[PDB]
From a paper:
Here, we present the [name] structure of [name] in complex with the IgG1 Fc region. Our EndoSE235A-Fc [name] structure revealed a 1:1 [name]:Fc complex in which [name] engages a single Fc protomer through a protein-protein interaction formed by the [name] β-sandwich domain and the Fc Cγ2-Cγ3 joint, while the [name] GH domain engages the Asn297-linked glycan on the same Fc protomer. In the EndoSE235A-Fc complex structure, the Fc region is located at the cleft of the “V”-shaped structure of [name], between the GH and the β-sandwich domains. Altogether, [name] in complex with the Fc region exhibits a narrower cleft between the GH and β-sandwich domains than does unliganded [name] due to the presence of the substrate. The [name] EndoSE235A-Fc structure shows that loop 6´ (residues 312-324) of the GH domain interacts with the C´ β-strand and the BC loop of the Cγ2 of FcP1. In addition, both loops 4 and 7 of the [name] GH domain also interact with C´E loop of the Fc region. These interactions between FcP1 and the GH domain of [name] cause a distortion of the C´ β-strand and conformational changes in the C´E loop. The trisaccharide interacts with residues of loops 2 and 7 of [name] in our [name] EndoSE235A-Fc structure. The β-sandwich domain interacts exclusively with the Cγ2-Cγ3 joint of FcP1.
Author numbering:
A (entry chain C), C (entry chain B): 237 to 443
B (entry chain A): 48 to 987
Write the structure that this text describes.
């Protein structure tokens, strides 16, 4: 029997109010015997027929992945509305239903702060400028780095981590030279987060 | 139509309708339906107030095996007629249902169900004989968490008067409200009185008391015995807080273990055995209640049975009949076994019950399911049940000869018959199953005919039937002689590899007294052990007796032998004792081990021999009659034991047969060096004193005996100076490190790694003064003979060089004293490369109250020092500091061969010899040290 | 058929000798009425029979799962010894084997830098004292927050975000009252990790 999995949009899209989140239901491990998949979308649990099926993607186990994508309202999604994928196939005793939503709870704004290396830290050769984004709810959030208004790539950003107070937290470290990170240069961490206030946050950095 | 002006709606239902108000609090169209339904509910409520409830007519006493049932009120078509899937009616339950467990689950206040009970279903149940008992949760009756009426802590305090009020209200509301016929208590920990999921002791006791007062108002002990007192719980009795307090008040006890787990119990790997077995439960209740008082419940297949509840405990829907939610074949149903199921011990069951009684006739979902979520016919498709399955099963049980009533054809003596009924019961099956005490005190009993029928009875008191005249097996309970259970299981349990069950039947306790008219008493060939229970003084008319072939120790002098001598004297004074009138021989006494042994020491010379420890030391078999047999010759004296001039024992029980074995019992040797052995062989080639612990095969912790093997000269026992050590400065964590000094060897699980370094150190002071002579450290192999921790390749003990350093300074700055400059190396271990579970080495009368040792695996590459246990060896010696100071002073002066003259030197040599003897002695004698020190200070 | 999952001990448990490190292999997958489960666990390829199969702590119905927990010496886990449990039961075709150990790879010393709270963190009731620990291999490590020489429970950490040098990294933020943060009693970040000196370290903080 085939299997169905419902994925949400990219975190930045659901994490900036300007963007349009969508739920796409891709069915994997779908055997030749029961290849047919019928899709029903649902916004906030209400069945919707605006899902759009993409061409199938064959898996490495000689199975196919078949996807139907339905657009959701960004604020609806961030508010915990349920995007639901109903998958129908001849191998199932009944249609399969799956539901997803934003993390429940009052959203908490991410506070984003970029700090340069500690004097002990900047004593290294490649000092890191770190933007910690904390107090963020629901955990759904996205962060990115930049320096002098230009994106900084020598950076790794951790996934949001649900804090002990129900919000989420994370850190992103942009590695520069301790010559450069402490050279003197303004970095800006730009965040678009469903957990961010106005689905955005900023972190300033300097030597 | 406001909800505050409805009059007839209960304040609860009103609180509900106003919470439903808050939701959609202003929606123009839903504020209508909520008020229109609060209204239609008020119309129903007043229809509930004006009905004419049927008067409760007297109901015939419940007698014989019963069939009860818990009917899901949510599954009744009249509870809420709006739910059209429910089409069955509990009034359709057949007459084969002996007991009607009124379930109040999912019935509104305005619900038709109450009226249907009162006016239709309650009358019919009466007219058919079905009595209705309402069940409530312990939470319903205790706690405040959703306790309903019990929430009113003012209306019902946890006080005597408060409890009385709570009881009156509860009985009114749930029993008197409908003039109900019984009270059932759910005991499921879920139903247990709860508040914030926390035990309310006042709640528990107060519910005990309120049920007890209701049982003073209803039930066997109550004002209204017509109302019953039932008790059913999922919890095992030993966890029923109300078991103890409610037993005396309860009328009925119900218990349903629906499912394979309840039938067979669960499985524990720790004991690798079944747990929570049926017999365990019935026994637990027996601690509180009579098996007659016991009724068991099974489960029909309930609609929409989810995982857990979907037990399929009865026959399931056939796989082919995928749309057939009813399957009626009980043949091979686990419930079939239940209908046949009777508790192996104790007695005959009170009867049977059914959980989800409202599901009689509906099949269980086939196992080829539960992967489907939205598809279930047998489980989740609605059917209208005629309860036909329930009828079939109840009739099948109702046709069990096992429940046949005990009758006068069983006990011809109407006195004896009535007395048995009074003390045992009325079912014939009881006698085969009765496993209790039997007090027979009516002198009117002229004959014991039928007493043979008692198969499982626990105790039997013949306490005054003077009219009875002869005593033999035919009038002696079946349990009279020893035996094993003969009751075959009817339980279709899940035990498969555990397929043996003789269940040795303990021979019944036969108390006999006031059988003044008893003339013939035949207990021969009963394999009995003692005469206990026989009021020999009460068999005044005794004329014939035979007790041959018992398991009784009739060796003269026994209390058994005493009663036997009395009886023999009675016979020799009545008609003369002779080989015809009296028989006692063919005993096969079972030897038990003695409780204590007196040989606390075994002395042998120092020779290159070897000795079997147990044989020389672990010995002795005492009788339950106290007959101590301690040798083959002792058994030969038992062979020499004569009764009436001849033995009373079976000629076949050879001493071997007679002998009990102490093999498989272990030993724990312990030489004077606190070294240990476990060879029953012990070689006297070394002069040593060892301490021997006897362990049963059954226990290696509490010694059955302790002993002192002694090859050559006795040695003072050493002492674990390590016991009570004060942790001092060292790499090892002192908190953990004390564990090595912890006296106990410790478990495999316990950590024995001192420090994260091939060598790791630990200082520690000793508890008290002593004479130190040795030390030892356990390798992990002691903990587990097979450990991967490498052994200490080299180690060292040192003391703080208090001679050169101020010990006060060390105590002030222990970390500062972490230098061997602060220390004095005293000993060093060095593994030569042989596997060993511990190392040990003597000590030259060491003195430092504080010590500091390092161990070393010598394993460089991230091999850390891990030491199992730390052993410091010596004797107790008060004033060790001062005495050892005197000893070193004596050493120094004895070196000062220029300072003292020869005449002083001779006394000094005598004194040094004394100190030498004293270095390892147990009784500290500082006097000689002081006298020598005075001589030296005078000489200085 | 059943399935086995082996969980290493908490990095602190494996890092503080006062604790008892252990890996727990539990089987909860396809099982039957037949309850016999000869759980078997190995270490470095040598199977140890000894064990303490947890008494079923399941409160009530519907939890037929057996879990075995094997305590391991630090010098044994640390030495990267590979504990593989092969569990045999009659319902199974053959014993199922799964292995866990101390993670392979060159241990890498964490580099610790302290960052004081962002000003917004003091505007928050809880201000965050941050310890960034980077360049640590393997990812297993224990960090903790304390104040006034006493532990601070209001601390949160992050997953071991693989450093670009193959080690793992994270930031930890201890939260304290912004009034407490203003009057900050001396805090300490105490870390037990083999990559630490004496596998144990404290980082100081004060007002
Ligand atoms: C765990 O085992 C029990 C016993 O086999 C399962 O049976 C019974 O399930 C019903 C329906 O869920 C429970 O009834 C409700 O319980 C609440 C407790 O607050 C009570 O207020 C309601 O009036 C109603 O009776 C019942 O407690 C439960 N136990 C018994 C002895 O009947 C139970 O369902 C199993 N667990 C789950 C989650 O299903």
């Amino acid at each position: 029997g085939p299997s169905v999995f419902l994925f949400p949009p990219k975190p930045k899209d659901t994490l900036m109010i300007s963007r349009t989140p969508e739920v796409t239901c891709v069915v994997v491990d779908v055997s030749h015997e029961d290849p047919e998949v019928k899709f029903n979308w649902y916004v906030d649990g209400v069945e919707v027929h605006n899902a759009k099926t993409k061409p199938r993607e064959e898996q490495y186990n000689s199975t196919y992945r078949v996807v139907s994508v339905l657009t959701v309202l960004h604020q609806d999604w961030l508010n915990g509305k349920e995007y639901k994928c109903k998958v129908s196939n001849k191998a199932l005793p009944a249609p399969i239903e799956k539901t997803i939503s934003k993390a429940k709870g009052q959203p908490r704004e991410p506070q984003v702060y970029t700090l340069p290396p500690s004097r002990d830290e900047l004593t290294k050769n490649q000092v890191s400028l770190t933007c910690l984004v904390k107090g963020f709810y629901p955990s759904d959030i996205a962060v990115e780095w930049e320096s002098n208004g230009q994106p900084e790539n020598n950076y790794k950003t951790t996934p949001p981590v649900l804090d002990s107070d129900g919000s989420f937290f994370l850190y992103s470290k942009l590695t520069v030279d301790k010559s450069r990170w402490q050279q003197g240069n303004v970095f800006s961490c730009s965040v678009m987060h469903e957990a961010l206030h106005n689905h955005y946050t900023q972190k300033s950095l300097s030597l | 139509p406001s909800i505050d002006s409805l009059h007839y709606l209960s304040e609860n239902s009103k609180k509900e309708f106003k919470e439903e108000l808050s939701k959609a609090g202003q929606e123009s169209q839903k504020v209508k339906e909520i008020l229109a339904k609060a209204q239609q509910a008020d119309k129903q409520a007043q229809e509930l107030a004006k009905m004419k409830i049927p008067e409760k007519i007297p109901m015939k006493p419940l007698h014989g095996p019963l069939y009860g049932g818990y009917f899901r009120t949510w599954h009744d078509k009249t509870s809420d007629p709006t739910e059209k899937d429910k089409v069955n009616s509990m009034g359709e339950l057949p007459k084969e249902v002996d007991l009607a467990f009124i379930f109040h689950d999912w019935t509104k206040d305005y619900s038709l169900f109450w009226k249907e009970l009162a006016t239709k279903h309650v009358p019919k149940l009466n007219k058919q004989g079905t009595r209705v008992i309402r069940t409530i949760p312990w939470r319903f009756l205790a706690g405040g968490d959703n306790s309903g009426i019990a929430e009113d802590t003012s209306k019902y305090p946890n006080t005597p008067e408060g409890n009385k009020a709570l009881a009156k209200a509860i009985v009114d509301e749930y029993v008197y409200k409908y003039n109900l016929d019984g009270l059932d208590v759910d005991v499921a920990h879920d139903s247990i009185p709860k508040v914030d999921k926390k035990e309310d002791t006042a709640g528990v006791e107060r519910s005990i008391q309120v049920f007890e007062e209701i049982g003073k108002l209803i039930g066997p002990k109550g004002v209204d015995k017509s109302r019953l007192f039932i008790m059913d719980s999922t919890y095992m009795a030993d966890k029923n807080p109300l078991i103890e307090r409610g037993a005396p008040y309860i009328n009925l006890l119900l218990v349903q273990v629906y499912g394979s787990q309840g039938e067979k119990g669960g499985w524990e790997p720790v004991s690798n055995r079944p747990e929570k077995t049926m017999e365990e439960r019935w026994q637990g209740y027996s601690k509180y209640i009579r098996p007659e008082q016991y009724m068991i419940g099974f489960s029909f297949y309930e609609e929409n049975a989810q995982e857990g509840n979907l037990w399929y405990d009865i026959n399931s829907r056939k796989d082919e009949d995928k749309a057939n939610g009813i399957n009626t074949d009980i043949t091979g149903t686990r419930a079939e076994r239940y209908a046949r199921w009777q508790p192996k011990t104790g007695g005959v069951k009170g009867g049977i019950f059914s959980y989800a009684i409202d599901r009689d006739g509906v099949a269980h979902q086939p196992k080829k399911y539960a992967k489907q979520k939205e598809f279930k016919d047998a489980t989740d498709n609605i059917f209208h049940s005629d309860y036909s399955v329930s009828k079939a099963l109840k009739t099948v049980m109702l046709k069990d000869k096992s429940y046949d009533l005990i009758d006068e054809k069983d006990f011809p003596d109407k006195a004896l018959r009535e007395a048995v009924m009074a003390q045992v019961g009325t079912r014939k099956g009881d006698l085969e199953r009765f496993n209790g005490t039997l007090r027979l005190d009516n002198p009117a009993i002229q004959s014991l005919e039928g007493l043979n029928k008692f198969k499982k009875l626990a105790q039997l008191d013949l306490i005054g039937l003077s009219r009875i005249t002869k005593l033999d097996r035919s009038v002696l309970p079946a349990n009279m002689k020893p035996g094993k259970d003969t009751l075959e299981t009817v339980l279709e349990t899940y035990k498969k590899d555990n397929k043996e069950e003789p269940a040795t039947i303990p021979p019944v306790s036969l108390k006999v007294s006031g059988l003044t008219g008893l003339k013939e008493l035949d207990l021969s060939g009963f394999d009995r052990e003692t005469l206990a229970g026989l009021d020999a003084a009460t068999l005044t008319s005794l004329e014939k007796v035979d007790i041959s072939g018992n398991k009784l120790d009739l060796a003269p002098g026994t209390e058994n032998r005493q009663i036997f001598d009395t009886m023999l004297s009675t016979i020799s004074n009545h008609v003369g004792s002779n080989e015809q009138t009296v028989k006692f021989d063919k005993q096969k006494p079972t030897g038990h081990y003695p409780d204590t042994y007196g040989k606390t020491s075994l002395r042998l010379p120092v020779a290159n021999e070897k000795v079997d420890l147990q044989s020389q030391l672990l010995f002795g078999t005492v009788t339950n009659q106290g007959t101590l047999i301690n040798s083959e010759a002792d058994y030969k004296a038992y062979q020499n034991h004569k009764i009436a001039g001849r033995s009373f024992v079976d000629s076949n029980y050879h001493y071997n047969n007679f002998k009990v074995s102490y093999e498989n019992y272990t030993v724990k040797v312990t030489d004077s060096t606190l070294g240990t052995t476990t060879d029953k062989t012990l070689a006297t080639d070394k002069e040593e004193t060892y301490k021997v612990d006897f362990f049963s095969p059954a226990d290696k912790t509490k010694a059955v005996h302790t002993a002192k093997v002694i090859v050559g000269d006795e040695k003072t026992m050493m002492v674990n100076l390590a016991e009570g050590a004060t942790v001092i400065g060292g790499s090892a964590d002192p908190v953990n490190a004390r564990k090595v000094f912890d006296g106990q060897l410790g478990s495999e699980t316990d950590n024995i790694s001192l420090g994260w370094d091939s060598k790791q150190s630990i200082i520690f002071k000793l508890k008290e003064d002593g004479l130190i002579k040795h030390w030892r450290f356990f390798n992990d192999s002691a903990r587990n003979p097979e450990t991967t921790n490498k052994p200490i390749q080299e180690a060292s003990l040192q003391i703080f060089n208090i001679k050169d350093y101020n010990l006060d300074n060390l105590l002030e700055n222990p970390n500062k004293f972490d230098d061997e400059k602060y220390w004095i190396t005293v000993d060093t271990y060095s593994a030569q490369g042989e596997r060993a579970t511990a190392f040990s080495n003597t000590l030259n009368n060491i003195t430092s109250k504080y010590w500091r040792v390092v161990f070393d695996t010598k394993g460089d590459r991230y091999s850390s020092p891990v030491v199992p246990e730390l052993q410091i060896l010596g004797y107790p010696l008060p004033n060790a500091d001062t005495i050892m100071k005197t000893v070193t002073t004596a050493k120094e002066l004895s070196q000062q061969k220029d300072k003292f003259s020869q005449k002083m030197l001779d006394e000094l040599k005598i004194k040094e010899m004394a100190l030498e003897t004293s270095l390892n002695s147990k009784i500290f004698d500082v006097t000689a040290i002081n006298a020598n020190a005075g001589v030296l200070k005078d000489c200085i």
